[PDB]
């Protein structure tokens, strides 16, 4: 998923 990819960066 797109959103999950960015949220991994934030976390």
């Amino acid at each position: 998923s797109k959103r999950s990819f960015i949220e991994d960066l934030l976390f």
Partner: antibody, heavy 121, light 109 residues
Framework: QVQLVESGGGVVHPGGSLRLSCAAS????????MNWVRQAPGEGLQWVAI????????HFAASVRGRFTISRDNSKNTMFLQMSSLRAEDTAIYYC??????????????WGRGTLVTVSS | EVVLTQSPAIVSLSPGERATLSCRAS??????LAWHQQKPGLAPRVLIY???NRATGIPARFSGSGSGTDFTLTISSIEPEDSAVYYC??????????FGQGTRLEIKR
């Protein structure tokens, strides 16, 4: 209407374990990251934990890290906070909440009713 | 990481006057700051989001301002019903949410 209802509060012996659940309704649960926030008997808000919309990203404040685990089920619109090795500082009212997300346009902020946890022999 | 400090600790004011509550961040958080209201005995309720925008059902006497490190919440026509504790909360570090210690508004009579 949107509603967040916490359950599982109670007295728990020091060093013991307790499992808190948050039931969501009225909004697309699976779209929101979910937080836990706690409040000591006369003190202010203290952020505790966050669980991502999908559930593979978790974070915990340092004071509860290694003792708390977090889970969510998007088919029941429920989330669970599993507390262990509980001590006096964990005595609080516990809220579940969405706190704005990470988008440029902030996502809505919902607050639960809250549940009381007392750590006492 | 982003510490929020709130001033004053307590503010006592007569109805109809204007309150100004301050929230300073240890590092820039842009406009990603929100204000919550808690009347003790009840759960919190979001008041301002994105540092200046009102939330659902919030009357127009409430107003937020600022960006970066300094932020203010302004209440213009204080009502007795505004007797409450106000918290600021940043989302700039979105995996790491933080709250300010709180500011209490007592209504003079």
């Amino acid at each position: 209407q949107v509603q967040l209802v916490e359950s599982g509060g109670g007295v728990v012996h020091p060093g013991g374990s307790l499992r808190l659940s948050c039931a969501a309704s009225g909004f697309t649960f699976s779209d929101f990251a979910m937080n836990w926030v706690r409040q000591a008997p006369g003190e202010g808000l203290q952020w505790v934990a966050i669980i991502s919309y999908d559930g593979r990203n978790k974070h915990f404040a340092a004071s509860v890290r290694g003792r708390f685990t977090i889970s969510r089920d998007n088919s029941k619109n429920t989330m669970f906070l599993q507390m262990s090795s509980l001590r006096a500082e964990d005595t609080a009212i516990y809220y579940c909440a969405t706190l704005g997300g990470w988008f440029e346009e902030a996502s809505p902020t919902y607050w639960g009713r809250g549940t009381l946890v007392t750590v006492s022999s | 990481e982003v510490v929020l400090t709130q001033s004053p600790a307590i503010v006592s004011l007569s109805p109809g006057e204007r309150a100004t509550l301050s929230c300073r961040a240890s590092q820039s958080v842009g406009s990603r700051l929100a204000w919550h209201q808690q009347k003790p005995g009840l759960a919190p309720r979001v008041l301002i989001y994105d540092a200046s925008n009102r939330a659902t059902g919030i009357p127009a006497r409430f107003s937020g301002s600022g960006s970066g490190t300094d932020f203010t919440l302004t209440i213009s026509s204080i009502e007795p019903e505004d007797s409450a504790v106000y918290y600021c909360q940043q989302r700039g570090d979105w995996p790491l949410i933080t709250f300010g210690q709180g500011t209490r508004l007592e209504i003079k009579r």
